[PDB]
Amino acid sequence: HEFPETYGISDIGLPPKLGVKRAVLARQLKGYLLFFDQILASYFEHLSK
Amino acid sequence: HEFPETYGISDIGLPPKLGVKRAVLARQLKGYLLFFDQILASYFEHLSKIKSLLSLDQGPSFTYFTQAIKDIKDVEELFKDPTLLENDEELTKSLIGKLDDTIERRNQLMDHLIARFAENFSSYAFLMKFLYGESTDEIVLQDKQSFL
Amino acid sequence: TYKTPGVYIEEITKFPPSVAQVETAIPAFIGYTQFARTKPSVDSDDLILKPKRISSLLDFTTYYGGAQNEQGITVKLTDTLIEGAENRTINVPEPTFKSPYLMFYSLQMYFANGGGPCYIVSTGVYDDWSDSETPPTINFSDLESGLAVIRKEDEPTLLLFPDATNLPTDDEFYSLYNSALMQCNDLQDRFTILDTYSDQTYNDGVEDLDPIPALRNGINLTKDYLKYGAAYYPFVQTILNYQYSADEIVIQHLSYNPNAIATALDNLNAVNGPTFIDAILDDLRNSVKVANFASLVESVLSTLNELIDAKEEINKDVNSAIASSEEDNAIKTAISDALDVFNEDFEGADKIESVAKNLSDLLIKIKQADTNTKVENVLSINALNFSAEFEKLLTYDVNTGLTASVTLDLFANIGTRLDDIIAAVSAAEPIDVNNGKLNGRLLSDIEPLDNATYNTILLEINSHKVTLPPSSSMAGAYARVDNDRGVWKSPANIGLNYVSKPSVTVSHEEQESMNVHGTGKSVNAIRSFVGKGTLVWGARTLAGNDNEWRYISVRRFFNMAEESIKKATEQFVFEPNDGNTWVRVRAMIENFLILQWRAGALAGAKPEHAFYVKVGLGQTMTAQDILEGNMNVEIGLAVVRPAEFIILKFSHKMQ
Amino acid sequence: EQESMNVHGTGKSVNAIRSFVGKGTLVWGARTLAGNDNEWRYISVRRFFNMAEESIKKATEQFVFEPNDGNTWVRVRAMIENFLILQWRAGALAGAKPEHAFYVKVGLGQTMTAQDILEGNMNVEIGLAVVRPAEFIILKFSHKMQ
Amino acid sequence: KSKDFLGTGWGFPPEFETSIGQVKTTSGVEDIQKSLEILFSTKIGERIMQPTYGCNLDELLFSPINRTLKTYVIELIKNAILYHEPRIDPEKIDITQGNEIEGELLIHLQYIVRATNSRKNMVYPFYLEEGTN
Amino acid sequence: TLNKHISIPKDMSSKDDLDFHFLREEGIRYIKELGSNFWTDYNTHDPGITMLEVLCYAISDLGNRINIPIEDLIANEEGGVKGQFYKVQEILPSAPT
Amino acid sequence: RKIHFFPSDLANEPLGDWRNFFSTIVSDKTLISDIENLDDFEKLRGNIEEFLAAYDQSGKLTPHLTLFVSFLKLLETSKKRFNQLTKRHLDFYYQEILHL
Amino acid sequence: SEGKLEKLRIVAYKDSKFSDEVENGEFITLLNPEKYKFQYRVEQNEDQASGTSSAPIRFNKILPQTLEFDFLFDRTGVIAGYEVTEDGIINDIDHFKKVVYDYNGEKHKPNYLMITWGSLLFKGYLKEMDIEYKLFRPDGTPIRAMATTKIGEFVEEELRTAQENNQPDMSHYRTVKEGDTLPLMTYRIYGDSKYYLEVAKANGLTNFRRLKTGTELIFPPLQKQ
Amino acid sequence: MITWGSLLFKGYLKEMDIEYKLFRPDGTPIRAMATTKIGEFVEEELRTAQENNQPD
Amino acid sequence: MSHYRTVKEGDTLPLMTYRIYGDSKYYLEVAKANGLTNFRRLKTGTELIFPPLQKQ
């Protein structure tokens, strides 16, 4: 949620006119970024315990 | 008398067009402020009595004093019983009353004045108890005044 | 009225409006108000179907009034023990039942967003709730009446209905708007601003409907009507507070140790005794003559007033016992019945309260009787009621030096009845396990008893904000644009005042279907942008695919230009129909249009490419028109249209 | 007490002399003994008229034995209008332009008939809009959040 | 509790309650509105050790209404606010006559409440480190 | 027990996990040491650098919660310390011998 | 208890007194149930002194008491000056009347 | 009273707050000036180094203002509304000089002036004056003169700081709207984005990366020593 | 920022003179003439980007 | 220098001291130089003196 709209990984999505390929690439980036979020989420979770 | 006209507690009153509620509130403020004036009036009153407190002829029966306040236009309505405002001695008994421990305070004043002549009446404290009971306190103060 | 020269400060004053001017953004608002009176201090309502011009909220408030107090506010408190210490939780939820009357709030938004003078038409005035869960409803035919009324006024240019979304069905909602679009086409000078029915999937009693698809099916008129309006979506969350009265809010209390009954019972034990009512009952049971009499009356009157106050205190505590006795409803009934009987000595059944009231009025009259006659000082007792009112306390006390012959009396039945109340209340002491001291009491009542809790509750109540349909803010925004740039400037990319956020977030995938659609029934979007806040995005009409009428600014420009020319030509109506008139009509129209061209409304490098006017026999008229008395004038106009899209391209060379 | 001096059922107003803090003794109020009247409640209005009427009366003495016809009626009008236009510029009379401040009418069929010509009468009608004082000031306050 | 530099104080026409032994107080915007009522209700020399507090609007009683007067009225109001009420900025002063006969002058003052704390605002937990002048 | 005036320090430098600029510089130093053969453009339009700055921001947030005082971090929903500590009334007194 | 109190909803009619405005000073209401008839103030004075200590520099008093107490504290400087009169009187007599 | 020709007035004052009038210190003209003129000056610092193409321009000061106008005195007898006087314009000029020029021994200076005509209202001091005498009676009594005048501007120092409401030194509050972030709001208030963790600690925020859209925040000033 | 057609200029006011010419009878002005002088402002970060200074 | 005034109704001692000296704080020295005890109420025929301030 910290990235710009241009990247296409936010709640409002990406405009249809930009085509499928760009939408697909946005999906690929979300996948990559989860490797960083799952780790951070663990540390926050550890405080709760 | 030190406040502005806007407050409504001065001699010229408050204009009718402002309504009853504002006039009522002015009455409430006058009530509150009397708690400050009655105390100040007492201190001024106390200066007027220095001559009596230290008199060689005859001292007063009270050691604390008060005054009626009459430069306020409705005091006849503010007080539950206006009678007291006609006599400062009754007002004193009602407002200060017992707080004034006259027997002990009167003796301290008399003893000081007697001491100024290098005299001493300590023995009356017990010698009079072989003659009188509780009534000695009045008798002894009368004798000390006569001595001076 | 002032009598003494001076400087006065007043909270409420009337202002002297006086000069009207021609403007293009003038809405009419049709809906319900608190009152509707020409004279600020009369009881009659006489402005309801009389359209009136308002310059600010300051005028609205003196003829129509404010908002209705909400009846749906709930306050709940809970007491619990932590390691032995008490801990109180305060809970004030959002109301689910809200008043349906929104005109006041809508006007506040209109003025906040830059609106000017406007017309108010009331369709009636506010009514009452039936219960805390039953709000009043809106009758469709009231809005239709108001529309028929505004039809006869010439000045208004925009049509709005502040309470349309509270109609019982969507079918009524759509019918109302189709009527407005048809009226705009009949008159040829107005534009309609439309809202959806709801921002949430709503149930029609049969099926669950999506709001944008539902509005599109609802408005089933053709292009000839659709070109006269536009719709906006979603609703907006504002910063306005709800109106309420603290006295009307009841507080629920739950606690680990139940002390509600115990409190009420201890207060009643104090009640049933000599320091509360026996002393009252024992005592209760010619200019000089008037003064003496008047004193004696006042003494009785004062005594009666104390007895009356006593009744009110009793009801306030007994009711908490009733409210708190959740279990064993048999006891709730026993308590309630005992109280209901007690009250009969004070209420209309045998009204002690009216005796006290009447003695007061009579007492004033006898004191003033001395103003002019000895007769008045007799009539006030034997023609009027002093004899008659004292009798209602004791029927014939005068029979003996000691009051006697009390064939009837209003006094002391209180003793037995208080005993009955206490006995019934005491039955609840082993019944009530969960209610605290304030349970069943009013918010205003607690203020003396507790203050930390009271202030906390008020802060929580005021955290709840008002939500409104967007149309009233748009009317405000239209006024700003017309003054800053002109009627030919598009309303889009303008920020809104007093808006925290749109009710819902609309994604790009969704937004494309709002702007371009097979039906042409476009919807303009309200959006939040980073660092900017809430903006209006898009400015198309309900005929959004049309080659001539898809933009709002184009349609509004034409309505304006046509009205101005029409007025300019009235001066020639009864002139001879010949060449000496035809030439004068042309010169005048051309002068109007050349000014609009210089102003930037019309397109074209020089007038020959911006506009034309044709008048003449053999051009626009024939011999038969001269005989009939007709005159035909043909006008064409090239207009300026907005940019909506920006396309960039980059290319390079090596140094 | 002061309110009953300024406004009263009889119209017989009394002006008050008052002491103000930091100023001393001032005259407070300026009404006539017909204080509820719509035209004559202010002192300055009544005194202005007495002055204006005397000045016009003197100005018209030069026409007393002139023929009673159009060549005189026109001269009387021009003179009266000149007096009044000066008073208007001076600030005594109300109105944005002379058409709203005053008028003078003289003529047969307007103010005179055939019988007046025979009797030797001449009728001149004059109207005047005058300036009145402010007595009360009313304030109001309202606010907005930044 | 963000808007704590506007402060809290006694209501102007102080009212005393009996349901609790307290005098009513005001805060925030309510307090500002009562401050304005006080300032324009008092004359310049009426306070004892504050010989320059209040206003001179009474100078204009029993005078005709014109452009010179209106200019003077506006000046008097603006200076009184600049000297004595640090929490606001005047927005507009509208001066009009609503009566052809009655001696009435109508003045409407509109103003804006400041979002930042003034160097002249004596509110207890702030002036100690922020009240420079 | 009076209220004090509240202000904020002006020396925003700690050289630890709460210091954004410090973290950003260390990030870039590590990148050069490990991957400068392939990744040399460190300008602000670069997606790589953009991701680094986002992560640095997230780290500061974590560090800030770790510093929340114990009284709150181990609090119970209902208050008290029943399962965490024994109180002096319970753990210090001794049977009488 | 000797002063009338006027409610804001009556046309200047009295209803009660000012009793409730000083009721927060005394922590045990027993001692003031008939205060106007006392001849022994030792218990009452004791509770008042506890009150004064408890709120000294607490920041917690209602504004009408805050003024009253601040006023009473300012008056302590008057007591200091006033009680020097006995010395001034003695000095005057020995030095200006008797010339010693 | 629209139709009234208003005449220009000048009043003398004793104090710098303009509330205590000099007795018999008011001048009213008999003929209005044709026009008047104002002057405004702002000064900047324009030092730059050699080799550069432009300078950094720094604000330095706002200089005092200036008003100028001309007067005509005439008692010949052709202007409607006025009378011919036995001594001509001798008492008109002597009263005009007593108000605007003469030294006052009570205050050890010349007078404070307020100049009012219509929309105009100006406070200050006389700087310059020239008077030229044109027509005379045979015995040497003047009946016409022309005067040129220059006035400076006065502001009292307590009023200057109230008009320059000078505000990182004071306290501030805002309400959160949708679309706001904490480092962007910190930049617009302080000039730097780096103070966002001190703003979050002063408000008790733990999840500052998502703000809720009704929250009112405080922004404390920076410490000075 | 001063914009008219092709013109676009950023800076500061240095000098101004205003002269009042016509008046209504009650002293309300209806005509005036103003002369103005504007200086030029460049921020220092933009000066080095415009002077793309390049043996180094 | 030295000064004298006569008391008119509406005068107070701290307001008159401010107009003569420039400061209201000298009112207790003016009352002592005139022998006034009840200075909070002035009688409206009294002539007062206002001495100058001492120099060294």
CSV table of N, CA and C in Angstrom, one decimal, chain H residues 135-170:
chain,number,residue,atom,x,y,z
H,135,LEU,N,-2.3,86.8,-4.5
H,135,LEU,CA,-3.0,88.0,-4.6
H,135,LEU,C,-3.1,88.8,-3.3
H,136,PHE,N,-3.1,90.1,-3.4
H,136,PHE,CA,-3.1,91.0,-2.3
H,136,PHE,C,-4.1,92.1,-2.5
H,137,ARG,N,-4.7,92.6,-1.4
H,137,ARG,CA,-5.4,93.9,-1.3
H,137,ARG,C,-4.4,95.0,-1.3
H,138,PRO,N,-4.8,96.2,-1.7
H,138,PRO,CA,-3.9,97.4,-1.8
H,138,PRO,C,-3.1,97.7,-0.5
H,139,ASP,N,-3.6,97.3,0.7
H,139,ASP,CA,-2.9,97.6,1.9
H,139,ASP,C,-2.1,96.4,2.3
H,140,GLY,N,-1.9,95.4,1.5
H,140,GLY,CA,-1.1,94.3,1.7
H,140,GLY,C,-1.7,93.1,2.4
H,141,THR,N,-3.0,92.9,2.4
H,141,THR,CA,-3.7,91.8,2.9
H,141,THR,C,-3.8,90.7,1.9
H,142,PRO,N,-3.3,89.5,2.1
H,142,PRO,CA,-3.4,88.4,1.1
H,142,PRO,C,-4.8,87.8,1.0
H,143,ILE,N,-5.2,87.4,-0.2
H,143,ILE,CA,-6.5,86.8,-0.4
H,143,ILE,C,-6.4,85.5,-1.2
H,144,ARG,N,-5.2,85.1,-1.6
H,144,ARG,CA,-5.0,83.8,-2.3
H,144,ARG,C,-3.6,83.2,-2.1
H,145,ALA,N,-3.6,81.9,-1.8
H,145,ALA,CA,-2.4,81.2,-1.5
H,145,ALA,C,-2.5,79.7,-1.9
H,146,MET,N,-1.3,79.1,-2.2
H,146,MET,CA,-1.2,77.7,-2.6
H,146,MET,C,-0.2,77.0,-1.7
H,147,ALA,N,-0.6,75.7,-1.3
H,147,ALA,CA,0.3,75.0,-0.4
H,147,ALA,C,0.5,73.5,-0.9
H,148,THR,N,1.7,73.1,-0.8
H,148,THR,CA,2.1,71.7,-1.1
H,148,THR,C,2.6,71.0,0.1
H,149,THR,N,2.3,69.7,0.3
H,149,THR,CA,2.4,69.0,1.6
H,149,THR,C,2.9,67.6,1.3
H,150,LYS,N,3.7,67.1,2.3
H,150,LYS,CA,4.2,65.7,2.2
H,150,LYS,C,4.0,65.1,3.6
H,151,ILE,N,3.4,63.9,3.7
H,151,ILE,CA,3.1,63.3,5.0
H,151,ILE,C,3.7,61.9,5.1
H,152,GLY,N,4.4,61.6,6.2
H,152,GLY,CA,4.9,60.3,6.5
H,152,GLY,C,3.9,59.4,7.2
H,153,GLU,N,4.3,58.2,7.4
H,153,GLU,CA,3.3,57.2,8.0
H,153,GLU,C,3.8,56.7,9.4
H,154,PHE,N,2.9,56.6,10.3
H,154,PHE,CA,3.3,56.2,11.7
H,154,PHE,C,2.5,54.9,12.1
H,155,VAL,N,3.3,54.0,12.6
H,155,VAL,CA,2.7,52.8,13.3
H,155,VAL,C,3.4,52.6,14.6
H,156,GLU,N,2.5,52.5,15.7
H,156,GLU,CA,3.0,52.2,17.0
H,156,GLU,C,3.5,50.7,17.1
H,157,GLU,N,4.6,50.5,17.9
H,157,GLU,CA,5.3,49.2,17.9
H,157,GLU,C,4.5,48.1,18.4
H,158,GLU,N,3.5,48.4,19.3
H,158,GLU,CA,2.7,47.3,19.8
H,158,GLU,C,1.7,46.9,18.7
H,159,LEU,N,1.3,47.7,17.8
H,159,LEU,CA,0.4,47.4,16.8
H,159,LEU,C,1.1,46.7,15.6
H,160,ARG,N,2.4,46.9,15.4
H,160,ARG,CA,3.1,46.3,14.3
H,160,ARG,C,3.2,44.8,14.5
H,161,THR,N,3.5,44.3,15.8
H,161,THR,CA,3.6,42.9,16.0
H,161,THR,C,2.2,42.2,16.0
H,162,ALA,N,1.1,43.0,16.2
H,162,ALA,CA,-0.2,42.4,16.1
H,162,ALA,C,-0.6,42.3,14.6
H,163,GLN,N,-0.1,43.1,13.8
H,163,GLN,CA,-0.4,43.1,12.3
H,163,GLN,C,0.5,42.0,11.6
H,164,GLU,N,1.7,41.9,12.1
H,164,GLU,CA,2.6,40.8,11.7
H,164,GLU,C,2.4,39.7,12.6
H,165,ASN,N,1.4,38.9,12.4
H,165,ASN,CA,1.1,37.8,13.3
H,165,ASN,C,2.1,36.7,13.0
H,166,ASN,N,3.3,36.8,13.6
H,166,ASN,CA,4.4,36.0,13.2
H,166,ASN,C,4.2,34.6,13.9
H,167,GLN,N,4.2,33.6,13.0
H,167,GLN,CA,4.0,32.2,13.6
H,167,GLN,C,5.2,31.3,13.1
H,168,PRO,N,7.1,25.8,13.6
H,168,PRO,CA,8.2,25.5,14.4
H,168,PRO,C,8.4,26.3,15.7
H,169,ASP,N,7.6,27.3,15.9
H,169,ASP,CA,7.6,28.1,17.1
H,169,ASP,C,6.3,28.0,17.9
H,170,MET,N,5.1,27.7,17.3
H,170,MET,CA,3.8,27.7,17.9
H,170,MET,C,3.2,26.3,17.8
